[PDB]
Design an enzyme around this catalytic site. Structure first.
Site, PDB file in Angstrom:
ATOM      1  CG  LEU A  22      -2.003  -1.088   1.168  1.00 58.08           C
ATOM      2  CD1 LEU A  22      -2.493  -1.365   2.583  1.00 58.08           C
ATOM      3  CD2 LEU A  22      -3.183  -0.665   0.266  1.00 58.08           C
ATOM      4  N   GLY A  23       2.016   1.196   0.683  1.00 58.02           N
ATOM      5  CA  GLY A  23       2.873   2.318   0.776  1.00 58.02           C
ATOM      6  C   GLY A  23       4.104   2.018   1.594  1.00 58.02           C
ATOM      7  CD  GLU A  24       8.333   0.712  -0.334  1.00 57.81           C
ATOM      8  OE1 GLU A  24       8.855   1.489  -1.134  1.00 57.81           O
ATOM      9  OE2 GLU A  24       8.641  -0.496  -0.241  1.00 57.81           O
ATOM     10  CB  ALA A  26      11.743   6.718   7.328  1.00 59.55           C
ATOM     11  CG  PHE A  27       7.404   3.165   8.814  1.00 56.71           C
ATOM     12  CD1 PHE A  27       6.880   1.980   8.344  1.00 56.71           C
ATOM     13  CD2 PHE A  27       6.789   4.366   8.448  1.00 56.71           C
ATOM     14  CE1 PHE A  27       5.828   1.962   7.452  1.00 56.71           C
ATOM     15  CE2 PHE A  27       5.661   4.365   7.595  1.00 56.71           C
ATOM     16  CZ  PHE A  27       5.198   3.160   7.094  1.00 56.71           C
ATOM     17  CE  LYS A  29       8.101  -3.546   1.520  1.00 54.82           C
ATOM     18  NZ  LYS A  29       8.254  -4.528   0.400  1.00 54.82           N
ATOM     19  CB  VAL A  30       1.603   0.187   4.974  1.00 55.39           C
ATOM     20  CG1 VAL A  30       0.211  -0.265   5.413  1.00 55.39           C
ATOM     21  CG2 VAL A  30       2.213   1.093   6.044  1.00 55.39           C
ATOM     22  CE  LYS A  46       4.300   2.501  10.649  1.00 56.49           C
ATOM     23  NZ  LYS A  46       3.797   3.760  11.280  1.00 56.49           N
ATOM     24  CG  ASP A 143       5.913  12.579  10.119  1.00 54.64           C
ATOM     25  OD1 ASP A 143       6.391  13.407   9.313  1.00 54.64           O
ATOM     26  OD2 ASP A 143       5.992  11.355   9.923  1.00 54.64           O
TER      27      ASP A 143
END
Ligand SMILES: Nc1ncnc2c1c(I)cn2[C@@H]1O[C@H](CO)[C@@H](O)[C@H]1O
Length: 337
Positions: A22-24, A26-27, A29-30, A46, A143
């Site tokens: 779904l997304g990325e 720094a931590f 990815k999701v 996540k 953030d």
């Protein structure tokens, strides 16, 4: 390595089958997953890097979410619901309700076209309300950015637009939620002077003057402008350049903030140490301009949005509008009856 455990078809915790990413961040990815122990319901997981700083942030996020999801179990104030967490090959994994596209990704996939003003109004109201809820519970997000505001459903209708001469996606339901509580900080916790570099950083953060809830209001101002234009008005990751951009758009910084900052490097005789005539300087001058000159129309609703944005981008955090006041701004009158 994350790449070993985050692929399509992998099973996490004997339960969650990975569909796609779904997304990325720094931590890590999701990923969207099918939850085989909850009837095949799709969820977002996540997957956090096995790296100290991100493990720590993930543990913090879990604690914040337990608090927010307990205080507001129906998500009236639109913080994402955390369903559970587990470890998988040494990676913290947090399971969330599945949401739609981020407001960033929606803009990106619509060819960087801005949102329509009525949607900006609804979304702004919800963001302010959600973040104000955080502010009421002694939290600062820190953030906020379009990647961290997600549509509950990103489904859209699509038509040719004669005025822009391209196909345009229009959102069916603009309702949002706020995500990513990995940096969220309680009033009684240490507010580190050290904060890492973004487009949505407030001046008090850049100048290390201390921060709290007002830094969120700054970010929200930046977000709204981006929603209005389809692009960011602070496209840099250099701090000094960022300050030069601010000055071009908002005028010179308050002398008293320049005097108090430990970050002497940026200044010279209490003025920003910035060569306007350098190649970077000439870029800043031509790309940035006074805030109001970004308005696409002089219509009153546009003027109301920009008045709110200007108040959110007050330099001095002690004078900046609070979200509680923002919620009463005339720009939101159309939402009330
Ligand atoms: N619950 C969710 N449902 C769907 N997508 C999600 C989430 C969450 I948590 C995050 N994301 C996507 O991952 C990106 C980085 O967090 C975000 O920017 C976003 O693209």
């Amino acid at each position: 390595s994350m790449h070993l455990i985050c692929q399509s078809g992998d099973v996490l915790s004997a339960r969650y089958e990975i569909v796609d990413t779904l997304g990325e961040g720094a931590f890590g990815k999701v990923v969207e997953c099918i939850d085989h122990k909850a009837g095949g319901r799709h969820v977002a997981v996540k997957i956090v890097k096995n790296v100290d700083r991100y493990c720590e942030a993930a543990r913090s996020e879990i604690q914040v979410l337990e608090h927010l999801n307990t205080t507001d179990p129906n998500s009236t104030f639109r913080c994402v619901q955390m369903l559970e967490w587990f470890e998988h090959h040494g990676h913290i994994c947090i399971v969330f309700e599945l949401l739609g596209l981020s407001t960033y990704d929606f803009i990106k996939e619509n060819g960087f076209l801005p949102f329509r003003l009525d949607h900006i109004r609804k979304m702004a109201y919800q963001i302010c309300k959600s973040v104000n809820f955080l502010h009421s519970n002694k939290l600062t997000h820190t953030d906020l950015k379009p990647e961290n505001i997600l549509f509950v459903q990103s489904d859209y209708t699509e038509a040719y637009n004669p005025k822009i001469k391209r196909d345009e996606r229009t959102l069916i339901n603009p309702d949002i939620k706020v995500v990513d509580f990995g940096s969220a900080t309680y009033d009684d916790e240490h507010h580190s002077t050290l904060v890492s570099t973004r487009h949505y950083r407030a001046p008090e953060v850049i100048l290390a003057l201390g921060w709290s809830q007002p830094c969120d209001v700054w970010s929200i101002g930046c977000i709204l402008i981006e929603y209005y234009l389809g692009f960011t008005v602070f496209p840099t990751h250099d701090s000094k350049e960022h300050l030069a951009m601010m000055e071009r758009i908002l005028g010179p910084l308050p002398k008293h903030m320049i005097q108090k900052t430990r970050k002497r490097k940026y200044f010279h005789h209490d003025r920003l140490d910035w060569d306007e005539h350098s190649s970077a300087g000439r870029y800043v001058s031509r790309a940035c301009k006074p805030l109001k000159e970004f308005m696409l129309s002089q219509d009153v609703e546009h003027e109301r949005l920009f008045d709110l944005i200007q108040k959110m981008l007050e330099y001095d955090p002690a004078k900046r509008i609070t979200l509680r006041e923002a919620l009463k701004h005339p720009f939101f009158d159309l939402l009330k009856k």
